[PDB]
Every structure is written in C-alpha cells, then in structure tokens.
Amino acid sequence: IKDFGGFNFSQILPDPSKPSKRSPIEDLLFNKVTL
Amino acid sequence: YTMSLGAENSVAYSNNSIAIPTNFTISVTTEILPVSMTKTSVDCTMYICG
Ligand SMILES: *[C@@H]1O[C@H](CO)[C@@H](O[C@@H]2O[C@H](CO)[C@@H](O[C@@H]3O[C@H](CO)[C@@H](O)[C@H](O)[C@@H]3O)[C@H](O)[C@H]2NC(C)=O)[C@H](O)[C@H]1NC(C)=O
Ligand SMILES: *[C@@H]1O[C@H](CO)[C@@H](O[C@@H]2O[C@H](CO)[C@@H](O)[C@H](O)[C@H]2NC(C)=O)[C@H](O)[C@H]1NC(C)=O
C-alpha cells in the first residue's frame, strides 16, 4: 500500500504488469537507445 | 546455478512508526592502495645491437 503522504513515485518504481519488470522511465530509456 | 543477488527482506513501513537504535558497535576496516612501481631503465643500443 503506497501512501507516502502525497508524494507519488510511480514513474520510478517497477511495473508489475510488464514482463521486463522495469519502471516506466527505464523502459523509455531502453527503447530510446537502439543501435 | 543462477546467481543470487542477496537476502530478501521487507522493512515494516508505516505512516506513524519509527525505529531507533539502543546500542552501538565500533568497527575497524582495512583499505589497501598502491602508490608506486619500480623504476626501470633500458639502454636501447645495447639491447638492440650489443
Ligand atoms: C550493548 O552491547 C554490549 C556488547 O557490545 C553489551 O555489553 C555486553 O553485556 C553482556 C551482558 O552483560 C556481557 O556478557 C557477559 O559478560 C560477563 C562478564 O562480565 C560474563 O560472565 C557473562 O557470561 C556474559 O558473557 C558482555 O561481555 C558485554 N560486552 C562487552 C564488550 O563488555 C551491553 O550490555 C549492551 N548495552 C545495552 C544497554 O544493552
Ligand atoms: C501517480 O501518478 C500517476 C501518473 O499520473 C497516476 O497514474 C494515473 O492514474 C489515473 C487514475 O488512476 C489514470 O487515469 C491515469 O491514466 C494514470 N496515468 C498513468 C500515466 O498511468 C497514479 O494514479 C498516481 N498515484 C496515485 C496514488 O494517485
């Protein structure tokens, strides 16, 4: 239960839905860096 | 086998609870650093021709 007094860490904490288990910001970094 | 990253625990977070220590320990740790290496010299002429 994520009740941190109003602060919201969803964009930096891991995403259970995705199979990679990577946060929303980390996924854009991995997509953005392609050979 | 597959690597294990460490023991797993879950700190008991709550919005009106705190944890405070009641004792202490004093620890001594070691750290090692190299500062120099051997001073060597080579005379090219004697090495190559001789
Ligand atoms: C904070 O931690 C220290 C240890 O880091 C505690 O001191 C330790 O206290 C125990 C029990 O009083 C000592 O063990 C006993 O020692 C007697 C010798 O007097 C021996 O006959 C017993 O069989 C038993 O082994 C222990 O030696 C002692 N440690 C040191 C380094 O003196 C201290 O009590 C802790 N403080 C609090 C408030 O909990
Ligand atoms: C933390 O912020 C995120 C991002 O705004 C919130 O996620 C949104 O939640 C609303 C309501 O559930 C949805 O309509 C949005 O589509 C969500 N946005 C995204 C990008 O997923 C999240 O709800 C916030 N956390 C809390 C506890 O309110």
Q: Indicate whether residue A17 lines ligand 2 (CB < 6 A).
A: no
**A23 touches A15 (CB < 8 A):** yes
A4 CB-contact burial (10 Å; exposed 0-12 / middle 13-18 / buried 19+): exposed
Q: Which bound ligand lies closest to the C-alpha atom of A10? A: 2
| Alpha carbons A14 and A19: distance in angstroms, whole number | 11
Token pair recorded at residue B11: 């700190």
Residue closest by Cα to atom 20 of ligand 2 = A11
Cited resolution, angstroms: 2.7
**CB-hemisphere CA count at 13 Å for B32?**
0
Q: How was this entry determined?
A: cryo-EM
Q: What is the helix, strand, coil percentage profile of chain B, to 5? A: 10, 0, 90
